[PDB]
Amino acid sequence: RPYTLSVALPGSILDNAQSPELRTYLAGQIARACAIFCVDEIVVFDEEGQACVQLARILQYLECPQYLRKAFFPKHQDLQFAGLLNPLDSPHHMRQDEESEFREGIVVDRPTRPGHGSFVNCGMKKEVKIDKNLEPGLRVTVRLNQQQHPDCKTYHGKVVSSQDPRTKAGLYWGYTVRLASCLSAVFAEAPFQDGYDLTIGTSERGSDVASAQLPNFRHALVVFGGLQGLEAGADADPNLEVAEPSVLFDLYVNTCPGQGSRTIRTEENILISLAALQPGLIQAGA
Amino acid sequence: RPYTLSVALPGSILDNAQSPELRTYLAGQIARACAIFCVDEIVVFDEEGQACVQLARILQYLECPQYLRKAFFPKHQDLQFAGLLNPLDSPHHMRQDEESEFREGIVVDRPTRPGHGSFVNCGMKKEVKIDKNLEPGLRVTVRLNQQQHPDCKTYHGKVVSSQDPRTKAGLYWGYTVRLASCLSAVFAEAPFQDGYDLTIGTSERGSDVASAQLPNFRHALVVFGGLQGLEAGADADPNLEVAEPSVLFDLYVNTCPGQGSRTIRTEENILISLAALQPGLIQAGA
């Protein structure tokens, strides 16, 4: 299985926006930054919190394919500016008329005939029929059979792991989103039994990324502070009694030497930092 | 003299914004990207055009220190959303109460006494008096004398090259902005007699930036295409009869291998590309 990369950042960044419209745009900028770099997981953490819930909600809306949005998100006041947004244009976001090996779907909520598998809509012209009888409203990944009876009232396909499009066909297939009550929860509530075997924090107080060597790894995590830096969710977390955030991570880096602004915003810092790291990440995640 | 770096991009990117507010924010994102990376020059070029004039205007507003904005920009409808913007927080943007070796100023438009030098305001509590009698309304760079008669009705300082804060004290001191009628004007209308001795264009069609070696250089230029790529201002320019933009530049790079979005927006692409290049630029510009 290929390496994973997870990004963590505070919900509080949305409090800095200057209008609701831009509050939405900024959440959009995060999603795009993470998608461009093929991030597997985004962790929004409370820097000790509706900022966190809103940010996560937006992130999930944008990851979810369009044909599934009506079904998966009731109208909210967090998605009222959904429109003013940039698409991720990720490999799993396709038109109805686009031929593809795999497609996300939702299982229709119907009885079905006794032996028979579920009905799933993958935004194709016809529902897709499958192998198994699964609990409805649930989101799945379907691999469409290559032979498609030209007359059939449905298409046919098989449900598969959601890792398969990455691992089997090299395709980025979106991120997941995880809420964490604090900075220590970002590490502790990690989705891999494993642990995150490589953690990297960013700071203008850190060491030149040029002079950093990454250890071999399976699950990388990169953590961004707010406007107030990683110090704020570190002081404020009671499980962390430290005089500086350096020690929390395997590496602590400044990813933009000799910046010409006093401050880098975190939607800025995600692009710069992931760029500066991408080679590094690529050669160590072997 | 240290190396220079110039960024070029099309005005037409503003046509893609979805609201005037965001049209302004996006121009803001450009300025910030260029400031973070200490860019010396931004060239906005017409991809054969009010988009270009608006973008340039915004860029110049944001570079100009705040105490000089009233003086240098009449109220326009291009700066009506000036407010909804992010400051560059660049080394030449200081409070009135911030002690600094150098400060930008404007020469007051007054006669003065026959021998005597000009009056300049550098947003200090008192006007600054200088060495020379200069033509008024003109923008200058002032180095304040170290000894400051504590009673004097004015401070005293000397006008200096605007390169001095970079070259002498390592300080980023802003960019200039240049309009170009077409893609060939970006190269031809260059501000260095010299030429730009290193040109780099960006494309997902280009070669991995990992595998690129930069030649020694003095004046680098990096060029971004629109939504439609560099092809559009290349076909449309009549001085350029080529089947592909590769050949226009010394290097043609893809700066984000295996992206998980079909498209990178150019305010995105500036951050990623300059990051991916920064080391490279640093070691060749010796």
A264/B36 CB distance under 8 A: yes
Helix H or strand E encompassing A185: helix A183-188
Residue B93: name the closest of B12, B174, B186, B27 by CA: B174
DSSP-derived pairing of the beta strands B198-208 and A219-223 = unpaired
CATH architecture of the domain with range B102-163: Beta Barrel (2.40)
Closest-CA residue in chain B for A267? Answer: B268
d(CA A161, CA A163): 5
B278 has a chain A CB within 8 A of its CB: yes
Residue A284: name the closest of A198, A215, A195 by CA: A215
d(CA B25, CA B18): 11
Give Cα B77 distance to the centre of its chain.
22
Give Cα A241 distance to the centre of its chain.
30
List all residues 6 or more positions away from B140 whose beta carbon is below 8 Å from its beta carbon: B104, B105, B106, B107, B120, B134, B159, B162
Q: Give contacts of A275 with chain B, Cβ < 8 Å.
A: 255-256, 271-272, 275-276
Structure tokens at A212: 């950093």
B256/A91 CB distance under 8 A: no
List all residues 6 or more positions away from A74 whose beta carbon is below 8 Å from its beta carbon: none
- Please tell us whether the domain made up of B4-90+181-284 is placed in CATH 3.40.1280.10: yes
HEC per residue, A49-89: CHHHHHHHHHHHHHHCCHHHHHHHCCCCCCCCCHHHCCCCC
A227 has a chain B CB within 8 A of its CB: no
Q: Give contacts of A268 with chain B, Cβ < 8 Å.
A: 32-33, 36, 271
d(CA A267, CA A270): 5
Residue A8: name the closest of A153, A277, A199 by CA: A199
HEC per residue, chain B: CCCEEEEEEEHHHHHHCCCHHHHHHHHHHHHHHHHHCCCCEEEEECCCCHHHHHHHHHHHHHHCCHHHHHHHCCCCCCCCCHHHCCCCCCCCCCCCCCCCCEEEEEECCCCCCCCCCCEEECCCCCCEECCCCCCCCCEEEEEECCCCCCCCCCEEEEEECCCHHHHCCCCCCCCEEEEECCHHHHHHCCCCCCCCCEEEEEEEEEEEHHHCCCCCCCEEEEECCECCECCHHHHCCCCCCCCCHHHHCCEEEECCCCCCCCCCCHHHHHHHHHHHHHHHHHHHCC
Q: Give contacts of A264 with chain B, Cβ < 8 Å.
A: 36
Which among B88, B261, B264 has the least Cβ separation from residue A261?
Answer: B88
CB A282 within 8 A of CB B62: no
Cα separations (Å) of A225 from A100, B28, B59, B132?
39, 22, 28, 48
Query: DSSP per residue over A236-283, as a string?
Result: S-TT---S-GGGGSSEEEESSTT-SSS---HHHHHHHHHHHHHHHHHH
CB B132 within 8 A of CB B117: yes
Closest-CA residue in chain A for B87? Answer: A261
A22 has a chain B CB within 8 A of its CB: yes
Q: How far is A84 from chain B (nearest CA, A)?
A: 7
Helix H or strand E encompassing A180: strand A176-180
Rounded to the nearest 5 degrees, what angle is found at the Cα of B259, between the Cα atoms of B258 and B260?
115
A272/B275 CB distance under 8 A: yes
Breaks (C-N over 2.5 A) in chain A follow: 48
Kindly report, as residue ranges, where domains of CATH 3.40.1280.10 are found in chain B.
Answer: 4-90+181-284
Give Cα B4 distance to the centre of its chain.
11
Kindly report, as residue ranges, where domains of CATH 2.40.50.140 are found in chain B.
Answer: 102-163
CB A54 within 8 A of CB A27: yes
Closest-CA residue in chain A for B90? Answer: A261
Which among A32, A39, A256 has the least Cβ separation from residue B268?
Answer: A32
B33/A268 CB distance under 8 A: yes
CATH fold of the domain at A4-90+174-284: Alpha/beta knot (3.40.1280)
d(CA B26, CA B6): 19
Considering Cα of A202, then A203, then A206, then A211, what sign does the dihedral take?
positive
**Residue type present at position A177:** V
Residue B259: name the closest of A209, A275, A143, A159 by CA: A275
Helix axis angle for B266-284 and A266-284, nearest 10°, is 60
Burial of B108: CB neighbours in 10 Å, binned 0-12, 13-18, 19+: middle
Q: Taking the CA of residue A115 as centre, how many other CA atoms within 13 Å lie in the half-sphere pointing to its CB? A: 0
d(CA B179, CA B258): 33
d(CA A257, CA B36): 10
Q: Which residues of B247-264 are buried (b: 16+ CB within 10 A; e: fewer)?
A: ebbbbbbbbbeebbbeeb
d(CA A11, CA A180): 10
Q: Taking the CA of residue A122 as centre, how many other CA atoms within 13 Å lie in the half-sphere pointing to its CB? A: 28
Residue A27: name the closest of A56, A4, A64 by CA: A56
Quoted resolution (Å): 2.5
B90 has a chain A CB within 8 A of its CB: yes
Burial of B280: CB neighbours in 10 Å, binned 0-12, 13-18, 19+: middle
Interface test with A, best of B38, B254, B271, B277 (most A CBs within 10 A): B271
Could you identify the residue written with the tokens 């966190």? A52
